[model samples]
Target chain A: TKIKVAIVGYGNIGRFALEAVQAAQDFELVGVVRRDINNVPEELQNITVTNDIKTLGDVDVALLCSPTRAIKELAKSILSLGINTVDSFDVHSEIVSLKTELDDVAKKHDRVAVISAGWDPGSDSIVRTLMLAMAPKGITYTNFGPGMSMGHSVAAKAIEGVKDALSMTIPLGTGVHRRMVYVELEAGANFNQVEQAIKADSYFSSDETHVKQVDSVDSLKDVGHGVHMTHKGVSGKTHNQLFEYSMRINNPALTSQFMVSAARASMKQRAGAYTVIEIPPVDFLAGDLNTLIAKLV
Target chain B: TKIKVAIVGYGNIGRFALEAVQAAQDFELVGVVRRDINNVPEELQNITVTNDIKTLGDVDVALLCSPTRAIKELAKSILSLGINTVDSFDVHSEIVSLKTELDDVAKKHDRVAVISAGWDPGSDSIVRTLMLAMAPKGITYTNFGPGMSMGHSVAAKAIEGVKDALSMTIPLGTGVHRRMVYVELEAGANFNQVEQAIKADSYFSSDETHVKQVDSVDSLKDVGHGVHMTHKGVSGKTHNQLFEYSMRINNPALTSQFMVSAARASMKQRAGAYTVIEIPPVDFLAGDLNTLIAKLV
Candidate 1:
């Protein structure tokens, strides 16, 4: 049986979470909570939309996609009705307190609440825990975040050398736009001279542009982003042990996907608040496991 | 009911697995398998020690702690009897093939066989999978192995430079021993001066010792070992994302610990073959999970 899911925010992450629930067989998107029904996307017009949690009929799990400031009150009301919940709040200290508060409410209502269950505090925490256990003596762990954008706004004037250059202007919609440029130099061509010529071009005189050296211009078009964490185990002064984990993709989509997974798993968990670290890895459902392996093997 | 576990191959890794089973409340160490039981540890003397797997009666799971080359044949024979199994094989590529062969055997007998469920290829693989899923676009990953040992043998002769020094000899059992040394230098404390004094000393005349600068001599008395893996998510030439995981501890002990966790989880899985990546993270019975969290948090 699929868990009836209610997305408690219609923002980007929430929209992605909704899409994830719709795609997964284990979850059913039943309703969406948003302050303004008029702003709802055209595609979701047929689905249940509401600003009130009371209108969410028979929801098995709630994904709190609203901002962190709004999650505590929203989660409390949702948990009061005995619906399991998952959140991607990054603040660990706050989640600890929320867990203490939610524990009593959830236990009384017999519901599960997963807190800090997103990219950093969620999956990252779980990965770190496992790595620590792998190297129990001690570890120096580090992670850096907020992935790179596929394209960036040009806020710089170009410098020139001399060469053939290709450029395209992409309409970013909502009045925002960006220009992407590609350059190739002739044999024995001086890159410095080409760069100066480009900057000196009348078309680029008013616009500040930046040049980045890359193997291919097309790869940049493919929205690439990710985060990484490394744990180093030092013996004496020598670095002997290491465990590294990294990922690159659409960050927002990944966050939404994890929210749905945590929400679905929360349904089978014991009543009370917990992090994704406490949840078990979900089963692969036979062929699904093989499919994932096929990609790697 | 605690699962009855039989440890096959009574070497260091095997003995540690036996100890882990005895410590965990979820497992009961039923017996052990060894070709020659004459030198079985005194602590395991009371348990059923035998050379035959057929005599491992009422066992729910058998942990194959034997070497990798011997695992396929041993596991095939053991799984043929309808008993579930777990193994600590680190070679993931080989385990994939063994899984293919054991799939039919495990399914026919309604048994579960978990492979490569130990430290690196086991927990490390699962961690990497979660990380890749976290960043699904693309990732470049790297890992380095073995670990740092506290003391290493050095073979050298005397050299020039003058300094006062102190030394000691400690037996490392099994016919192995190491000499500990301390040196005090005069005015210009060139490392070469101390190095020469140690080599020229009567104790060092017949023995060779390497010197590693450290915070303290006492630290060297404690053995430090670990493994590390790093993943870099790159977009263009910019290194945007980094994730590294590493640990320092007794690698053998951690391997044994994870082996027991897999052995316990195997009992609950449906009939088939699996890797640690396939099995859900082990649940902590009461205090175990808290203990792990205490270390990380």
Candidate 2:
């Protein structure tokens, strides 16, 4: 059986997504939905290209590639057709609203799973769920943070990597006039450990910045978080349910100590080449591998 | 006619203070106070050395080169002798108490200014003062963030700028923690343009970890939020501030930018190299010259 995967953006990360899916054995890259096809690569040009979102309804999985502007509208159109959707850029506000809209739709269509947001959302949910199942009521404050240090040009290029493909919206607080938090941490803290804490604290505004270029990856910054940790020591009864877990990881560490520690939160960068790999499971972080089962029956 | 200067701690930034003051014809390196006389540099060994802070009372300007832990104790002892004190690393928890002490003692004597926590505290305060004054009401966030990219050895060398002169404290939640808020700014739709923002919100935390043999700067994960930001949005009266001035004055352009924008947040690398220089108001940034002078006075 062929699995039709529809991509909605044609830029950098999106391009990588297309190639990755095309190369996958079980999946097929049916088409890409983009506003302008002029900038798309030669190999992908042969496939269907349209500015419309309704066309994605026929595909098994619709991957949102456009920035924040097109997300909610696009998700709405696709979800109305009862098609499952997966987003490359996970932190946009539209994903949250889209989840609200499809709650009933998802429950009714048991065959469909719309992972509105990807990466940390997937791992964060899984890990926090695992952590909660283990400790339940005793979890207190958590801190999730990561960072990296790259030279000017490389940093810009790495950012470009995500922007060109994903066309994702720059998170609310990361543009020219935004006040972004650049955390400096000591070297040894695990990125996953930091993300676990960040999910608990909700201090990070998980806005993924577009990595423009790369070089020696001195330090990296990552975004991951979910529930809010309060100082009041809110008890298990008042505290939100903890059937979730947060996970962070760092690879090919080249940045400063503070940055290396930070990069472990989510994404990482290396010199010369980069790609958007499939996100991994988060529940296994707390030694809970068998609890999660993908039910098909 | 002459400024009698006494240096405490006698480390990197402190060593530079001696050269900087002596180079100026009006200032003389009258003496130095060190816990261990052997730790004093070869060039500074000739100066009068004493273990007690009281001996520093006669100097017109007492530049404290001690760590955060010893700064308050040293400052208290110096101030009690009816002397004025200047600090390089003055991150004492009793900053308020020190201010109160200085306020009362300064009334009787005309000297003693608690400035220079080097990179972060000293320069950050200057940046905060400026941003706070100019921002409109309701701006509640600011970040003084800068990060460096280098090998472990190089990064370690960089932090020498701060450690050479000052004796520092190990655990400081405010100076080296994520929860810390830099300078408070306003909150509104137009806040970004209404205030100033810098590119680097990073710093080096060399003193916290004693393991100098570490090969990677990434070894610093044990250190908390050495990189700091401030955010507080309450009602219409917003107050949050955070800014990052670069660490490199390696070029004239960067030097000008450093003078105009970044203040040293830490002496991670460039420790004894004429570390402390007077900050005069830059064009436009300083506002009117009279106001600048008045604030400085």
Candidate 3:
């Protein structure tokens, strides 16, 4: 039997998540749950789309690709309707609370909810868990991109006077970063105003920021990003066990795929809430346990 | 209450496992289970040591650090006795049958067993899973060693007339390997006989082999080993997603710790036998789900 998945929100991650469900051998795409059916994108024309998820009928899980601000209400209502939910909520500080409140609602309604199913909080979270298990006592350093991450790139575009933008991050070890901001200004917009606003945003404020006016940010745009994570530790009293993990990815695409994986895991779990790390890694993928072990292990 | 654990062998991995159980916050080290009570190691003197596991009483799990040959009996008997088990069984070809037989026994007896808790089959297996999830369609290359791995080193020592040995694997890409073999001979032994026997062995027969006699293999004996795993693939129809993971470790020590973690996972699973990837990655860790997310994610 296949798990039926419905995609909520047609944003970048939502659209990508729809394809991930299509690619999965065990998943059947139920449709996209849109807030506004009148605004359906061209790619989604042949597929099913609806503003209300109840009309989709028999969705095992819903991929909540809506904004992080909408997660609390969206997850609660979806869980109440008895469909499991998986989302790529970005804010790190409030995840604990999000997990707590969702846990109570999910268990109360007998459905699972997987929060923060994005790369850093999702796939990389599992990587960090593996590193810790390898060496119980260690320090792990997470290094970010030489290019703009989806979140920062999207944030730069939201500045009032900008037509398009790309925010690249340069790593200066020990957790510090420098931003290389490139923006394409509208015909009547001032580069100085746009540059000042970009630096003032929370994502750029703490870092050493630079803003450059470009003729077109489109040529400078590439959704690809990567990270290098290293852990140095002592395992079983023997010192100096080192583990390094790196990835080069199209941020939104991978994040969406992880959400798809999380949806698979959600169906296998007991009624409650989970982050990506709480679920079995293989449950995030297709196929049975031994089959994967025989192929990959 | 802490999970009571028994270390089933006095081998290198077993001794490290004893230390791992002791260091783990949620584990209570019960003692070592030896084949011969008459021959106890110096370090195990202060700790509880026994031949019959029943004497230990109410053990939650057994870390089967015995030979791969010894695992079937060890696992069957232990599981029937109502204790979960974890082992580092390295034979690649036989794992499927091993898992099948052990899985039946485990389910019949209502206990969990996790096989192949060593790094390549154990930890790297999880890395492969994450890579597949990130990019559903891809190729992963596993490269190993600038030093002698424990299994190879142990195999070399088993050759007649060899006092000590170390076997290092040099990967020549696309899966072929070259072996760098070093051995120390006894008072009267032919290097030619030793060399001929090493090449005759199955492990060395497949790989490119070289052997050299050294004064003392002790000086060359460093248990450190490592692997570089890379996977390049497409995520959600977007191409060029690449993942690279590397590790430098004391092979036996980390393998032991991984087995220890697997035992923790065994307790959390239902009555069945599992490979490491089948269990939740974080279940192999200490602390609750949300706490770890708050700390690591």
**Predicted candidate 1 versus true structure: per-residue lDDT over B186-258, tens digit per residue:** 4465776567666666556665454433334344443334445555442112234445555555556667767
lDDT, candidates in the order shown: 0.62, 0.40, 0.86
TM-score of each: 0.53, 0.33, 0.91
Alpha-carbon interface RMSD for all candidates, in angstroms: 6.5, 13.5, 1.3
Go through the candidates in order and give each one's DockQ.
0.10, 0.02, 0.71
Maximum-lDDT candidate:
3
TM-score of chain A of each: 0.68, 0.47, 0.91
* lDDT of candidate 1 over A30-57, digit per residue (tens): 8888888778687587889898867878
Give the top-scoring candidate (TM-score): 3
Off by over 4 Å in 2: A1-297, B38-40, B51-58, B89-94, B137-244, B249-297
Which residue runs of candidate 3 sit more than 4 Å off their true CA positions?
A: A149-165, A184-202, B149-165, B183-201
What CAPRI grade goes to candidate 3? medium
The residue pairs found clashing in candidate 3 are: none
